């Protein structure tokens, strides 16, 4: 858990430190996204209608 | 003609879970389907309510997180804080609830600290499960509003560090229908409303009609204000 090579690898000779950053986002469906069913029928969402 | 009918509102048939049947008994033979449609379309779109719009769990920085001894992740807890049906009072318009426990079982919606003016309607709504005994604390923010639609909305500004935004379903009406019956010289409009619990059928339908009449009242003058 600490027995690394001070970078857990050679750290790309010529490079000192490598830092990674993870970003997460949520994505709702919208007009333009592609939908499909298991029977070979696809299509693009054109409108989100109000419920009434 | 002297046959001027003006309908009166009634609450026949309180049925089911939160299902009812409002009724408008004397209607003027032609004007009933208009009222049925306008009521159904204004209930399902313009009613205001209250819901949780932001949460702040204690030892939690973001939503894609995890707590010890808790059987859920924060993405699944913020998903249960959306089914909590709250009933605010007249002029509060905003407040912060509080939850805090030290038990070892299913945390529920009944576990919010008793604030005055607030009232949780579904009390056995699960929120989290503690599988071992520990201290679980969060502060939900409650607000009023209506479903103004997807694009235009409120971004729910965040102030402290652990604030997560919850997207609310403010409308309290779940499913409407209507029917029209013949009496002879008059008809009977019969509305079926199903709510979540934070409003009563008569008050709901008269609020719908208040909205509809304030809309119709611009064609009696053809004037802006």
UniProtKB/Swiss-Prot annotation, chain A:
Coiled coil: none annotated. It comes from the Bacteria. The RNAP catalytic core consists of 2 alpha, 1 beta, 1 beta' and 1 omega subunit. When a sigma factor is associated with the core the holoenzyme is formed, which can initiate transcription. Belongs to the RNA polymerase beta chain family. DNA-dependent RNA polymerase catalyzes the transcription of DNA into RNA using the four ribonucleoside triphosphates as substrates. This is DNA-directed RNA polymerase subunit beta. The chain holds residues 1046 to 1097 of 1358 of the full protein.
UniProtKB/Swiss-Prot annotation, chain B:
Residues 1-223 are annotated as: Alpha N-terminal domain (alpha-NTD). One of its GO terms (molecular function) is DNA-directed RNA polymerase activity. It catalyses: RNA(n) + a ribonucleoside 5'-triphosphate = RNA(n+1) + diphosphate. Its EC number is 2.7.7.6. The keyword Nucleotide-binding does not apply. Keywords: DNA-directed RNA polymerase, Nucleotidyltransferase, Transcription, Transferase. GO terms for biological process: DNA-templated transcription. GO terms for cellular component: cytoplasm; DNA-directed RNA polymerase complex. Homodimer. The RNAP catalytic core consists of 2 alpha, 1 beta, 1 beta' and 1 omega subunit. When a sigma factor is associated with the core the holoenzyme is formed, which can initiate transcription. Belongs to the RNA polymerase alpha chain family. The N-terminal domain is essential for RNAP assembly and basal transcription, whereas the C-terminal domain is involved in interaction with transcriptional regulators and with upstream promoter elements. DNA-dependent RNA polymerase catalyzes the transcription of DNA into RNA using the four ribonucleoside triphosphates as substrates. This is DNA-directed RNA polymerase subunit alpha 1. It comes from Francisella tularensis subsp. holarctica (strain LVS). The lineage of its organism: Bacteria, Pseudomonadati, Pseudomonadota, Gammaproteobacteria, Thiotrichales.
């Amino acid at each position: 858990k600490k027995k690394s090579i001070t970078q857990s690898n050679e750290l790309s000779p010529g490079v000192l430190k490598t830092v990674k950053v993870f970003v997460a986002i949520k994505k709702r469906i919208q007009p333009g996204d592609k939908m499909a069913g298991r029977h070979g029928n696809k299509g693009v969402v054109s409108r989100v209608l109000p419920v009434e | 003609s002297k046959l001027e009918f003006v309908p009166n509102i009634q609450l026949k048939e309180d049925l089911g879970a939160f299902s009812y049947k409002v009724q408008l008994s004397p209607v003027e033979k032609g004007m009933a389907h208009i009222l049925g449609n306008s009521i159904r379309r204004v209930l399902l779109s313009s009613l205001s309510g209250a819901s949780i719009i932001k949460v702040n769990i204690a030892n939690v920085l973001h939503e894609y997180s995890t707590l010890e001894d808790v059987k859920e992740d924060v993405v699944e807890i913020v998903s249960n804080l959306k089914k909590v049906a709250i009933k605010l009072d007249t002029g509060i318009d905003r407040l912060d609830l509080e939850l805090s426990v030290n038990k070892s079982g299913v945390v529920s919606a009944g576990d919010f600290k008793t604030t005055q003016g607030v009232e949780i309607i579904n009390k056995d709504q699960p929120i989290a499960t503690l599988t071992n005994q520990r201290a679980f604390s969060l502060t939900a923010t409650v607000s009023v509003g209506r479903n103004v639609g997807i694009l235009s909305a409120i971004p729910t500004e965040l102030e402290r560090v652990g604030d997560i935004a919850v997207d609310a379903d403010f409308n309290p009406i779940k499913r409407v229908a209507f029917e029209v019956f013949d009496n002879g010289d008059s008809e009977t409009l019969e509305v079926f409303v199903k709510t979540n619990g934070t409003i009563e059928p008569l008050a709901a339908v008269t609020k719908a009609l208040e909205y509809f009449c304030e809309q119709i009242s611009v064609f009696v003058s053809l004037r802006v204000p």
